[PDB]
């Protein structure tokens, strides 16, 4: 016998059925299921518990799904891809609720507003951040930056759009001003993913310089906004948009890695807590289950790995 | 002892070399010579494993039967634990595991009549600057119109049997000349 | 505490339970080639899944230019392989 930490059917589960590089993966905020997609364009849904049966599979993108996020109430899945389109998928219906056909190049990342009216921030190879409101065909905001933007998130109040890209500097756009109120400078190479802490105080940002830097995005900060730097993971010649994510208790951080290892760092000490093997290619996206200590990792190897971790 | 120097194997007594005496110390033959036969060895029961001969050439199989006490009778009206049948979970797990293991035979027997490899070589003079190679292994297309390539009417002796299991008999019963 | 190397790992050990280095001296007799982690007679073969497009790009850069990006996982500082002088220039 051995210790157990979750309702998983086994301490590690291997989920198989994707037909191409899995670029993105996310849990439902209610903890019931998870959704994953990538170069094979289908979006696969998996239950977190029991047999983890692939209970649904949405199709419709005409391109790789680069990024994929649940809305906070779990009633809709936002997804975006190389078909220049953001789509919102209704969970109960399984159907495209909206199709924001207004980007002019590949959409690299997407993030729905955490609360209030549902807004969808998106960043694209056209260089623009756009915020789309479900109620209008036209975007609410278009923030033209000069160079291709690869990652985006709102702040927690959903009134600043944070983005990064080929220029390595993160922009922070203030949605009442329509100006960059400040920039976060420090990455040596292009950003591959940005993720917002549950409390909203901090963001992490992954970059092809093989570091994750934690930034303080609170309105007042008494000095430097760079909180700390994590290292250990690696980005290879495939130049995938390796994502990053927060533990729901914020004690731990993850980032994708090209070295096959699933990395977890402790937020306070910056020590690597897990460096789990088992993938056979780039671990493109990593996420934590919102209620229970379970790790998701999605590989370029077409495999999804679910497993327990001791979140002590 | 720091005033003393050893030089003969007897000078150490039953102990080993002295680290405080910076002379080359060989408390037995150890290190004098230079570096086919297995070495006799005590077991965890403190007996000496002369029957280690019976274990050579085996895949760590169960035929450790080489002691008298494994040929003597054991418990009658046994303690009901090990002697209980395996449960339904065990027979189910064994059936599925063995099924797919011999499915691989029969499917490959009635058929008898992108992918990459990352390689971490040990010869680290290597590919240029690289701890690792990565290679695309394609499968060469078979011509369907090509007959069997090689003769297999060869016959060779069977592999020798696995080494003798010790015979483990009851002692001989003396035959009288009447028998 | 620690978990030794196994055909597959079930229970997701922490970092310190897997990657803690083996303590003590090392054989004078075996060469570094012979001490190395291996799986076949000559190295550690393991399956891989690259992007097909970028893999082809890196072949042709090495063949035609003399340098390529380093294929290793955990490449560290050695970002380029081959004629690294051209890669930097």
């Amino acid at each position: 016998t051995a210790q157990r930490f979750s309702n998983l059917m086994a301490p590690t589960m291997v989920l198989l059925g994707h037909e191409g590089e899995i670029y993105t993966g996310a849990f439902s905020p209610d903890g019931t299921c998870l959704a994953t997609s990538g170069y094979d364009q289908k979006i696969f849904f998996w239950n977190v518990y029991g047999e983890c049966e692939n209970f649904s599979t949405i199709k419709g993108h005409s391109g790789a799904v680069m990024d994929l996020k649940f809305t906070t109430d779990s009633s809709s899945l936002v997804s975006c891809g190389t078909d220049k389109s953001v789509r919102v998928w209704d969970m109960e219906t399984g159907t495209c609720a909206r199709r924001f056909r207004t980007h002019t190049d590949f959409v690299n990342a997407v993030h729905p507003s955490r609360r209030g009216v549902t807004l969808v921030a998106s960043a694209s190879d056209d260089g623009t951040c756009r915020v789309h409101d479900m109620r209008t065909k036209e975007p609410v905001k278009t923030y033209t930056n000069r160079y291709q933007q690869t990652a985006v998130t709102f702040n927690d109040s959903s009134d600043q759009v944070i983005s990064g890209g080929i220029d390595n500097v993160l922009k922070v756009w203030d949605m009442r001003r329509d100006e960059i109120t400040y920039t976060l400078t420090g990455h040596r190479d292009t950003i591959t993913g940005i993720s917002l802490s549950p409390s909203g105080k901090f963001i992490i940002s992954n970059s092809m310089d093989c570091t994750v830097r934690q930034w303080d995005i609170r309105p007042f900060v008494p000095g430097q906004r760079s909180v700390g730097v994590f290292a250990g993971h690696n980005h290879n010649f495939e130049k995938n948009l390796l994502k990053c994510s927060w533990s729901p208790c914020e004690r731990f951080i993850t980032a994708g890695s090209s070295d096959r290892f699933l990395y977890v760092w402790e937020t306070l000490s910056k020590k690597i807590v897990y460096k789990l093997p088992g993938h056979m290619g780039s671990v493109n996206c990593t996420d934590f289950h919102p209620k229970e200590p379970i790790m998701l990792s999605c590989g370029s190897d077409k495999r999804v790995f679910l497993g327990e971790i001791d979140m002590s | 002892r720091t005033s003393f120097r050893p030089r003969g194997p007897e000078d150490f007594g039953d102990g080993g070399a002295f680290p405080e005496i910076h002379v080359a110390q060989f408390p037995l033959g150890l290190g004098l010579g230079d570096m086919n036969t297995l070495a006799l060895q005590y077991g965890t029961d403190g007996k000496l494993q002369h029957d280690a001969i019976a274990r050579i050439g085996h895949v760590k199989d169960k035929v450790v039967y080489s002691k008298l006490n494994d040929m003597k009778a054991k418990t009658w009206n046994e303690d009901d634990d090990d002697i209980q049948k395996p449960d339904d979970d065990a027979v189910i797990d064994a059936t599925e595991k063995t099924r797919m293991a011999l499915e691989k035979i029969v499917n490959s027997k009635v058929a008898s009549a992108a992918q990459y490899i990352r390689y971490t070589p040990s010869q680290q003079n290597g590919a240029a600057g690289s701890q690792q190679r990565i290679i695309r292994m394609v499968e060469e297309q078979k011509d369907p119109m090509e007959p069997p390539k090689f003769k297999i009417n060869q016959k060779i002796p069977r592999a020798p049997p696995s080494p003798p299991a010790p015979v483990m008999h009851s002692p001989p019963r003396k035959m009288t000349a009447k028998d | 505490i620690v978990d030794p190397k196994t055909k597959e790992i079930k229970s997701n050990p922490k970092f310190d339970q897997l990657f803690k280095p083996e303590s003590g001296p090392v054989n004078h007799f075996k060469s570094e080639q012979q001490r190395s982690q291996k799986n076949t007679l000559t190295g550690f073969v393991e399956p891989a899944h690259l992007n097909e497009f970028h893999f082809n790009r890196q072949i042709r850069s090495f063949d035609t230019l003399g340098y390529a990006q380093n294929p290793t996982a955990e490449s560290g500082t050695t970002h380029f392989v081959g004629d690294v002088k051209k890669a930097e220039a």
Binding site: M9, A10, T12, M13, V14, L16, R260, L276, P277, G278, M280, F305, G307 | R118, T120, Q131, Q132 | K5, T6, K7, E8, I9, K10, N12, L18, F19, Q37, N39, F44, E46, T72, A73, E74, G76
Partner: peptide, 11 residues
């Protein structure tokens, strides 16, 4: 199906 993590090579 359930599974486990194959240990890769290391530097």
């Amino acid at each position: 199906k359930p599974g486990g993590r194959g240990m890769p090579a290391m530097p």
